Amino acid sequence: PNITNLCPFGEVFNATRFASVYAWNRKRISNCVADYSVLYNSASFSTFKCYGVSPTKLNDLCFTNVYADSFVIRGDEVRQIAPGQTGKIADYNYKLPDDFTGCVIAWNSNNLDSKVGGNYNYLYRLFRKSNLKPFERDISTEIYQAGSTPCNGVEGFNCYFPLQSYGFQPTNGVGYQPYRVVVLSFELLHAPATVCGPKKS
Amino acid sequence: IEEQAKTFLDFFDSQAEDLFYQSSLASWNYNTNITEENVQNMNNAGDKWSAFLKEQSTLAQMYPLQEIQNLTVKLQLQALQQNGSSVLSEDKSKRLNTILNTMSTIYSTGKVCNPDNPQECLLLEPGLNEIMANSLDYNERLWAWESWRSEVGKQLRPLYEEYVVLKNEMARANHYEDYGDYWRGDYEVNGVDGYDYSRGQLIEDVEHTFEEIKPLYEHLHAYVRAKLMNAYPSYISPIGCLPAHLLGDMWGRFWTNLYSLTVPFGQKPNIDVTDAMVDQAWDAQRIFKEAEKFFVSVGLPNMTQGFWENSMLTDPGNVQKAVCHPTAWDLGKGDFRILMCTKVTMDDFLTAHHEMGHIQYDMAYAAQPFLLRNGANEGFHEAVGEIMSLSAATPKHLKSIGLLSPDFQEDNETEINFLLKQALTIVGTLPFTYMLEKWRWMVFKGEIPKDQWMKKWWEMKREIVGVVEPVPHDETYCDPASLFHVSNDYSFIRYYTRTLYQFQFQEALCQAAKHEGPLHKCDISNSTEAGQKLFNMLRLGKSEPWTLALENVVGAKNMNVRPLLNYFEPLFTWLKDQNKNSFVGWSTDWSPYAD
Ligand SMILES: *[C@@H]1O[C@H](CO)[C@@H](O)[C@H](O)[C@H]1NC(C)=O
Ligand SMILES: *[C@@H]1O[C@H](CO)[C@@H](O)[C@H](O)[C@H]1NC(C)=O
Ligand SMILES: *[C@@H]1O[C@H](CO)[C@@H](O)[C@H](O)[C@H]1NC(C)=O
Ligand SMILES: *[C@@H]1O[C@H](CO)[C@@H](O)[C@H](O)[C@H]1NC(C)=O
Ligand SMILES: *[C@@H]1O[C@H](CO)[C@@H](O)[C@H](O)[C@H]1NC(C)=O
Ligand SMILES: *[C@@H]1O[C@H](CO)[C@@H](O)[C@H](O)[C@H]1NC(C)=O
Ligand SMILES: *[C@@H]1O[C@H](CO)[C@@H](O)[C@H](O)[C@H]1NC(C)=O
């Protein structure tokens, strides 16, 4: 049993660009041989938070889809990407379920994403009228109403545009530096052979 | 209505946390490279930040404070709902700005000449201060002193005559009785049960405390007078006020330059370890690393990577115009830096501890909402920086870290010389700060008529400080105008309150560290109980009443002089034993020009 249809994890962790957290990407991975060891033994990541599966089991486990969600956040917000958490990201930019089966992997991208003068290309949602469900994505740009009036869709007294940019700069201190986050969500529906660890004899 | 107000403040941070950072960096860049490009950039960024505050403030004012139950939101709203600038009409605003820029200019460009020797034309802060510091020539010192009053003081006076009206009108527009009352609002606590402090309370606490300080001052004053009379044998009366021009500075603010005349035991060496640093091949980096070790040893965080990579620790290595008066920076977004030009000497060693103490305070409250990221009140940033320096300077510390020889022996006479130098620095300045603010408050309040400003200025200096003018100047003069803090619109009482806080902190932390000796021998290095005790306050920023925040560390809701007196009691004891052949206290009738 030799293996060559390996999973494209080498792209998604290593991408030219990541999505804004308010509009996070969802990469579906299926029909492939995984080898998670190149992630867990990497010194490039600062964070490996596993809630379901673990670094010592994954190399030998099968799943029907693995989903690599990906986005850019401010470093202080890394702690919100977890089951059981709250806060502006956990509540409405990117929510993980309390029974999340996977692992959250993250790293500092200050030398990739920060720019002198401010990299404002990464947006986060400042406001919603409700919290998000796990793996829900909300990309509406309508004006957020805080007052008694919708004010006809303009910024104004108790009227706010819900998406604000992170002012990322190479000189910001740690916690104000950008971080790249990839979340591996795992599921087993119908045919587990669709994603598996390595094959032998 | 906090449904709207907290939402507004979340939007506020979403803009403010960036615009302040752009303004902040432009200011930094200017100071590290002084050039027209940076001047225009800091001015432009400055205006953007100011305009943003004005717009934002206008919106904050929609949300009445009386609707707000949540104190954190109420405090944040109070901070940006302040009216201040633009409460007055545009012409009044422009006129006041014109006056203030004019005052600053007259002070900073106020080049004074010697009519008998034109080569002596100088500004105060380069070279003319050397005459006031170090000359022992009574008449040379007088020429310098009088020349600043006649060439700078008189010229600023008419700006004060109009200024106090414009500032009081502003203060009234902001619902304060006068501008002195406006400034005193910094210490106000209002709406927190058990921690309240009215603005007028500061006056009572300052006056009450000062009366308790006086005995220490009177004995120090008598000692200094006894010594200055040998230096100036035909000029100083044994029972009178000291001449102002003989106190070591242009206004007599500190008595540190009198040390060379007053040293108790002149046969003894100092604990100046500049040579140790030089002989041991220290550099600026070593000095800051030793200061870092000091703070981490008590449980404080280390400096950030940014600090070590982009701070300015030394002067430029080329002919580069830059300003590096030592200062700590919090540039926003967790960017902390120090700016100074460190030389390998004991004064810069202590300065590094002072400035890093300010940075540690700034790091501690970095977690507060943007508008609460400040010290508990205006005197706390320095109270914290001063205790870090005060502890670093004690011989126990210096010997332990290799600056004093292993064979160094501290003795009876060394202690006295040490305490006197500090008393001249501290005790000798408390009456200056006290007197100046009392006078300015009385001026803003309208208690002192504009035709009686100098009459009371000098009467008060003789009654409170015990200093007398060499020249019976009339009302065309304005002595306090000639001082930087007055010409540049700063509150001054912060130094009084800071000094008292400094000693309350040192004593509380020294006890936390379980020290077994005299207060002046305290070293809380490598002691985490004291470090955590202070940290727990530093982290609060403006989120708590300063009275509460202070209680948490020192066991008091107010200022307390006892720690100061306890710090200097061994000196006082010596000063009481001294002066058995002299008079303690002074008259206010006698003057150096009397005849
Ligand atoms: C990403 O690219 C680097 C390039 O040095 C490589 O070492 C690494 O194995 C790649 N894959 C991942 C998942 O990081
Ligand atoms: C002088 O100002 C310029 C701005 O163009 C800056 O690039 C340069 O580094 C500054 N010089 C120093 C010594 O910082
Ligand atoms: C102020 O905000 C804090 C945030 O935790 C909250 O706990 C507190 O209850 C609020 N104040 C009031 C009176 O609700
Ligand atoms: C101060 O408050 C008054 C109250 O009406 C308001 O009109 C004024 O514009 C405020 N001024 C500033 C400069 O915020
Ligand atoms: C700060 O970082 C340095 C890096 O060498 C470390 O040695 C020191 O113990 C750290 N201090 C704290 C308080 O973590
Ligand atoms: C020096 O030590 C001696 C010990 O006998 C003491 O009597 C003397 O008063 C001390 N000197 C001073 C200045 O106190
Ligand atoms: C630093 O802490 C150590 C802990 O043993 C102590 O031995 C040393 O004397 C302390 N140094 C200073 C300067 O207090």
User: Do B185 and B281 reside in the same domain of the chain?
Assistant: no
* Interface touch B335/A158, C-beta < 8 Å: no
C-alpha closest to that of B491 among B98, B75, B186, B144 = B186
* Pairwise CA distance, residues B500 & B505, whole Å: 9
Contact list in B for residue A173 (CB cut-off 8 A) is 304, 306, 333-336
Residue B241's CATH number: 1.10.1370.10
Token pair of A183 as six digits: 């979340």
C-alpha closest to that of B232 among B140, B141, B142, B136 = B136
Helices B71-80 + B36-60 axis angle, to 10: 130
B208 is known to lie in a ligand binding site: no
**DSSP annotation string for A57-90:** TGGG-EESEEEEEEEEEEGGGGGGSSTT--SHHH
Residue A187: which H helix or E strand, with range?
strand A178-187
According to DSSP, the β-strands at A195-196 and A32-33 are: parallel
B residues 8-37 near A, CB within 8 Å?
A: 8, 10-11, 14, 17-18, 21-22, 25
* Pairwise CA distance, residues B154 & B149, whole Å: 7
With b for 16 or more beta-carbon neighbours within 10 A and e for fewer, the B55-80 pattern comes to ebbebbeebeeeebeeebbbbbbbbb
Does residue B479 lie in a domain region? Answer: yes
Q: Counting Cβ atoms within 10 Å, is residue B411 exposed (0-12), middle (13-18) or buried (19+)?
A: exposed
Residue B111, chain A, CB below 8 Å: the answer is no
Q: Measured between alpha carbons, how far is residue B60 from residues B65, B189, B560 in Å?
A: 10, 21, 37
User: Do B97 and B217 reside in the same domain of the chain?
Assistant: yes
* Pairwise CA distance, residues B276 & B290, whole Å: 14
Does residue B538 lie in a domain region? Answer: no
C-alpha closest to that of B481 among B123, B144, B122, B152 = B152
- Closest in B4, B14, B335 to A164, CB measured: B14
User: Do B345 and B450 reside in the same domain of the chain?
Assistant: no
User: Do B168 and B105 reside in the same domain of the chain?
Assistant: yes
Q: Is B528 in the pocket of ligand 7 (CB under 6 A)?
A: no
3-state secondary structure of B276: helix
Helices B528-538 + B494-512 axis angle, to 10: 140
Ligand 5 centroid to B382 CA: how many Å?
25
CB within 8 Å of B481: residues ≥ 6 apart? B103, B152, B153, B156, B157, B159, B160, B487
Helices B201-231 + B412-426 axis angle, to 10: 120
End-to-end CA distance of chain B: 72
Strand partners, A17: none
Q: Is the dihedral of CA B339, B340, B341, B344 positive or negative?
A: negative
CA distance A19 to chain B (A): 20
Residue B182: which H helix or E strand, with range?
helix B179-183
User: Do B180 and B54 reside in the same domain of the chain?
Assistant: no
CB B195 within 8 A of CB B552: no
3-state secondary structure of A196: strand
B495 is known to lie in a ligand binding site: yes
C-alpha closest to that of B533 among B364, B389, B371, B400 = B364
Q: Is B334 in the pocket of ligand 5 (CB under 6 A)?
A: no
To what resolution in angstroms was this structure determined? Answer: 3.4
Ligand 6 centroid to B413 CA: how many Å?
7
Does residue B324 lie in a domain region? Answer: yes
Token pair of B554 as six digits: 């020192």
* Pairwise CA distance, residues A119 & A178, whole Å: 10
* Interface touch B334/A173, C-beta < 8 Å: yes
Rg (CA), chain B: 25
For residue B28, how many other CB atoms are within 10 A of its CB?
20
SS (H, E, C) B142-169: HHHHHHHHHHHHHHHHHHHHHHHHHHHH
* Pairwise CA distance, residues B275 & B293, whole Å: 21
Token pair of B530 as six digits: 């004291």
B325 is known to lie in a ligand binding site: yes
Q: Tell me the best of B57, B80, B87, B176 to mutate to test the pocket of ligand 4, counting ligand atoms within 8 Å of each CB and taking the most.
A: B87
Sheet architecture: strand order including A62-63: A32-33, A195-196, A62-63
User: Do B50 and B116 reside in the same domain of the chain?
Assistant: no
Does residue B400 lie in a domain region? Answer: no
With b for 16 or more beta-carbon neighbours within 10 A and e for fewer, the B433-470 pattern comes to bbbbbbbbbbbbeeebeeeebbebbbebbbebbbbbbb
Does residue B488 lie in a domain region? Answer: yes
* Pairwise CA distance, residues B290 & B302, whole Å: 11
Count of structural domains, chain B: 3
CB B250 within 8 A of CB B133: no
Q: Measured between alpha carbons, how far is residue B509 from residues B380, B528, B534 in Å?
A: 15, 10, 7
User: Do B173 and B215 reside in the same domain of the chain?
Assistant: yes
* Pairwise CA distance, residues B172 & B193, whole Å: 28
Q: After which residues is chain B broken (C to N over 2.5 A)?
A: none
* Pairwise CA distance, residues A143 & B504, whole Å: 52
Does residue B49 lie in a domain region? Answer: yes
C-alpha closest to that of A194 among A12, A29, A2 = A29
3-state secondary structure of B468: strand
B212 is a catalytic site residue: no
B382 is known to lie in a ligand binding site: yes
* Pairwise CA distance, residues A140 & B284, whole Å: 54
- Closest in B7, B18, B336 to A173, CB measured: B336
User: Do B263 and B279 reside in the same domain of the chain?
Assistant: no
Does residue B532 lie in a domain region? Answer: no
Tokens 């007053």 correspond to B262
Ligand 1 centroid to A6 CA: how many Å?
15
CB B328 within 8 A of CB B322: no
CB B252 within 8 A of CB B432: yes
* Interface touch A164/B335, C-beta < 8 Å: no
Token pair of B494 as six digits: 């912060």
CA distance B309 to chain A (A): 10
User: Do B279 and B369 reside in the same domain of the chain?
Assistant: yes
3-state secondary structure of B263: coil
User: Do B514 and B431 reside in the same domain of the chain?
Assistant: yes
* Maximum CA extent, chain A: 69
Q: Is B301 in the pocket of ligand 5 (CB under 6 A)?
A: yes
Domain endpoint, select from B365, B393, B421: B393
B485 is a catalytic site residue: yes
User: Do B261 and B318 reside in the same domain of the chain?
Assistant: no
At B567, the amino acid letter reads Y
Contact list in A for residue B11 (CB cut-off 8 A) is 126, 160
* Pairwise CA distance, residues A132 & B500, whole Å: 53
Q: Of B485, B529, B551, B569, which residue is the catalytic one?
A: B485
Interface test with B, best of A93, A171, A177 (most B CBs within 10 A): A171
* Pairwise CA distance, residues A164 & B385, whole Å: 37
Contact list in A for residue B1 (CB cut-off 8 A) is none
3-state secondary structure of B375: coil
Q: Of B188, B290, B355, B544, which residue is the catalytic one?
A: B355
Q: Measured between alpha carbons, how far is residue B594 from residues A141, B141, B240, B466 in Å?
A: 81, 19, 12, 16
End-to-end CA distance of chain A: 6
* Pairwise CA distance, residues A159 & A157, whole Å: 5
According to DSSP, the β-strands at A25-29 and A65-74 are: antiparallel
C-alpha closest to that of B297 among B521, B537, B528, B535 = B528
Q: Is B85 in the pocket of ligand 2 (CB under 6 A)?
A: no
Token pair of B419 as six digits: 């305490």
CB B338 within 8 A of CB B353: no
Token pair of B140 as six digits: 């040379």
Identify which ligand lies nearest to the alpha carbon of B191: 3
Token pair of B485 as six digits: 């803090």
Its domain, for residue B28, covers 2-82
* Pairwise CA distance, residues B29 & B323, whole Å: 10
Query: Which letter does DSSP use for residue B381 in this model?
Result: H
CA distance B316 to chain A (A): 21
- Closest in B3, B8, B18 to A167, CB measured: B18
B residues 493-552 near A, CB within 8 Å?
A: none
Q: Counting Cβ atoms within 10 Å, is residue B203 exposed (0-12), middle (13-18) or buried (19+)?
A: middle
With b for 16 or more beta-carbon neighbours within 10 A and e for fewer, the A76-102 pattern comes to bbbebbebeeeebbbbbbbbbeeebbb
- Closest in A157, A160, A176 to B334, CB measured: A176
Kindly report the backbone phi and psi dihedral angles of residue B533, in degrees, each rounded to the nearest multiple of 5, phi listed first.
-60, -45
* Pairwise CA distance, residues B289 & B468, whole Å: 46
**DSSP annotation string for A145-182:** E-SS--TTSSSBTTEE-SEEE--B-TTSPTTSSEEEEE
* Pairwise CA distance, residues B595 & B591, whole Å: 9
**DSSP annotation string for A82-121:** STT--SHHHHHT-PPPTT--SEEEEEE-HHHH--TT-B--
* Pairwise CA distance, residues B30 & B571, whole Å: 45
CA distance B377 to chain A (A): 26
Strand partners, A119: A168
Does residue B401 lie in a domain region? Answer: no
* Interface touch B333/A173, C-beta < 8 Å: yes
Pick the residue whose CA is nearest to atom 11 on ligand 6.
Answer: B412
User: Do B337 and B278 reside in the same domain of the chain?
Assistant: yes
Establish how many alpha carbons lie within 13 A of residue B225's alpha carbon, considering only the half-sphere containing its beta carbon.
28
Rg (CA), chain A: 19
Please give the number of the atom of ligand 6 that sits closest to the Cα of B265.
13
Pure H helices in B33-70: 36-60
With b for 16 or more beta-carbon neighbours within 10 A and e for fewer, the B358-390 pattern comes to bbbbbbbbbebbbbbbbbbbbbbbbbbbbbbbb
Tokens 């070591």 correspond to B248
* Pairwise CA distance, residues A156 & B397, whole Å: 59
Provide the residue count of chain A.
201
* Interface touch A167/B304, C-beta < 8 Å: no
Q: Is B459 in the pocket of ligand 2 (CB under 6 A)?
A: no
Query: Which letter does DSSP use for residue A134 in this model?
Result: T
Tokens 């046969």 correspond to B267
Which residue of chain B is at minimal alpha-carbon distance from A120?
B18
C-alpha closest to that of A105 among A172, A169, A36 = A36
* Interface touch A160/B21, C-beta < 8 Å: no
In Å, how far from its chain's centre is CA B544? Answer: 23
Domain endpoint, select from B82, B97, B127: B82
Query: Which letter does DSSP use for residue B32 in this model?
Result: H
* Pairwise CA distance, residues B566 & B500, whole Å: 12
* Pairwise CA distance, residues B401 & B242, whole Å: 41
In Å, how far from its chain's centre is CA B512? Answer: 26
Token pair of B11 as six digits: 């939007």
**DSSP annotation string for B88-141:** S-HHHHHHHHHHHHHHHHHHHT--EEETTEEEEEE-IIIIIHHHHHH---HHHH
- Closest in B7, B8, B333 to A176, CB measured: B333
CB within 8 Å of B554: residues ≥ 6 apart? B504, B505, B507, B508, B560
Ligand 4 centroid to B62 CA: how many Å?
11
Pick the residue whose CA is nearest to atom 2 on ligand 7.
Answer: B526
Contact list in A for residue B14 (CB cut-off 8 A) is 126, 164
Kindly report the backbone phi and psi dihedral angles of residue B133, in degrees, each rounded to the nearest multiple of 5, phi listed first.
-70, -55
Q: Is B302 in the pocket of ligand 5 (CB under 6 A)?
A: yes
Domain endpoint, select from B342, B362, B393: B393
For residue A4, how many other CB atoms are within 10 A of its CB?
5
Query: Which letter does DSSP use for residue B271 in this model?
Result: -
User: A132: alpha, beta or left, given left = phi > 0 and alpha = psi -120 to 50?
Assistant: beta
Tokens 């006290």 correspond to B434
Token pair of A172 as six digits: 């910001």
* Pairwise CA distance, residues B127 & B131, whole Å: 7
* Pairwise CA distance, residues B195 & B137, whole Å: 52
Pick the residue whose CA is nearest to atom 10 on ligand 7.
Answer: B526
* Pairwise CA distance, residues A180 & A110, whole Å: 9
- Closest in A157, A167, A173 to B62, CB measured: A157
Beta strands in B237-304 (DSSP E): 242-243
